[PDB]
Amino acid sequence: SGFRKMAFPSGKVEGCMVQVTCGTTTLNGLWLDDVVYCPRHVICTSEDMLNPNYEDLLIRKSNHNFLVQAGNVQLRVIGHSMQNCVLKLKVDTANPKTPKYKFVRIQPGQTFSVLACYNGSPSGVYQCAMRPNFTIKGSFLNGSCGSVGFNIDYDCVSFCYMHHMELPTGVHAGTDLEGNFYGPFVDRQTAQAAGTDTTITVNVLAWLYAAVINGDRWFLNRFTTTLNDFNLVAMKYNYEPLTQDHVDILGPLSAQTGIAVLDMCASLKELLQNGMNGRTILGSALLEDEFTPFDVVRQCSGVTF
Amino acid sequence: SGFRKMAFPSGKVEGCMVQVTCGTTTLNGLWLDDVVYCPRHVICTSEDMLNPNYEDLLIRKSNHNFLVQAGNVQLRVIGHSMQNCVLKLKVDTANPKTPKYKFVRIQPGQTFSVLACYNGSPSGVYQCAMRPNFTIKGSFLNGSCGSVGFNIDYDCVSFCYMHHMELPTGVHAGTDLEGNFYGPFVDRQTAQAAGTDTTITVNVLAWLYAAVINGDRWFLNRFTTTLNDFNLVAMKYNYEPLTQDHVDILGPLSAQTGIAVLDMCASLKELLQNGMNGRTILGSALLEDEFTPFDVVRQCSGVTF
Ligand code: NA
User: Both B203 and B178 in a single domain?
Assistant: First the structure.
């Protein structure tokens, strides 16, 4: 037993990370088959970033202008194109370590692992959630752009995130692998506030089920609630609405523990109204919301890849 | 910016994980060059575990009793021996993906990454600290034995932990890679309880420095204290005494932030005596002690491997 924030093993993604240099800017790229994907803002000078026209900037670049390095071997660039906010550099060599993969656009509240890289080399791996306001709370420094987020499922890597920027508030913003930003953000140096964030209710409930599975039960009570009355309480604590879809997704955990979803909702209602009274849950003094129901089952059942 | 519990990239270790089966017991092994290392209790039956004579049990085994599988490839066992609580199975094929490595015995309060595996396949990666009572708070299920903990340093994987068991209290125990348990534990089914734990003071200070580096400053006060006056409070809150060596280890973080260690100690003293004033630090409502000073530097400087 035990319950930890757990990242996916990173080796399959490590084998895809390369370094991309344009001008004096170096960041990371993702090498799948004979394409390297990276943020298009690699083509911008500091001056360009103030007001970039990416089509015109890309017109002015040659293939030679992009230095791509896999470890210490140069990969010759033979084409360059743009898809939304992502640059695609066609190279003359397909990556023999390309895993089975998909590009997916994830939902707010869903989790993924980030392989933080610099100069094409991995620094570390950690688990992130896509916040309801479409930012992520990561750990990213200069040079981290092009690091990716991903899930693994039976040796298929589903890439869902590529890192582009840090907002002045200290949260992080990026795109899917088709280059569409998550949230209302743009790759130009202009004002772009993130919306007000909220707590991911279905994930908090999943984590309470994880706690029960690991023997923490003190917060269970004998109260009941309807979905509507629970949501009326949770709205006042800046929790996202819980829908019947969320109730159904919590079905397997509810079935294993014998605790009906709405009874766990009554427990959560009491936790919100009363606090923890100096107690902790799974070693935490806050209600945690970055585990999905599937993350609970995946950790507690030993799923491998 | 941002500060997360960050594991090492796991690919170098993933390439060393195998499955070892003896009788009807399956667990994981670590394949380095032509030797597979795994917990010796793999040779015990359920009746053996009650009172195992490991020397006798090993003499009664032959090479054919061990089935070793590296992914889809069966590895032929050509020798077997025992070093303390670790079994060493010599195989007729050397692992071509063996990283440059060392076996290290870590000190309490130091951290490492765990690659949790089942049936020789990686499930997830997460950071652990060796607690002062020589347990770790991990996430391990049936079949996780033989999963390893490690650090990566420049060009070398330093393996420091192999997983053997879960205490009835829900914490985890294991050995170094020479087969010596951390703490007073033994690989037999007899009563064993962890000693009372304590909080790793130098790590809490390191994490407060991480908070300052990331813009959290609310807990800083203009006060300073002495090492002795701080240790008076530390003893009252089950914190380890702070030594001059531990002050020295905090030197680089103190230097970067311009906050003397004893000033931060005055801040920590006020936090211990008065609480966290309804605030969080780096998203936590509790003081965190599982980041070493070097973990802070590694994450905040983007060290790669
Ligand atoms: Na101070």
Answer: no
Rounded to the nearest whole angstrom, what is the distance from the C-alpha of residue A22 to the centroid of ligand 1?
A: 45
DSSP B111-122: EEEEEEEETTEE
CA distance B108 to A4: 20
Q: Does B217 touch chain A (CB under 8 A)?
A: no
Header resolution in angstroms = 1.5
A144 touches chain B (CB under 8 A): yes
- Domain assignment of residue A35, given as a range: 15-99
Number of structural domains in chain A: 3
Residues B136 and B1 reside in one and the same domain: yes
Residue B94 CB neighbour total at 10 angstroms: 12
Question: Domain boundary residue among A71, A99, A127?
Answer: A99
Distance B225 CA to ligand 1 centre (A): 8
**Spatial distance between the Cα atoms of B27 and B40, rounded to a whole number of angstroms:** 10
Do B109 and B192 fall within a single domain? yes
* Residue A121 burial (CB count, 10 A): 17
Whole-number Å distance between alpha carbons of A245 and A24: 49
Q: Is residue B32 domain-shared with residue B69, that is, in the same domain?
A: yes
The two structure tokens encoding residue B3: 């500060």
What is the phi-psi region of residue A66: left when phi exceeds 0, alpha when psi lies from -120 to 50, beta otherwise?
Answer: beta
Is B139 close to A172, i.e. CB distance below 8 A?
A: no
Q: Determine how many CB atoms are found less than 10 A away from the CB of residue A261.
A: 23
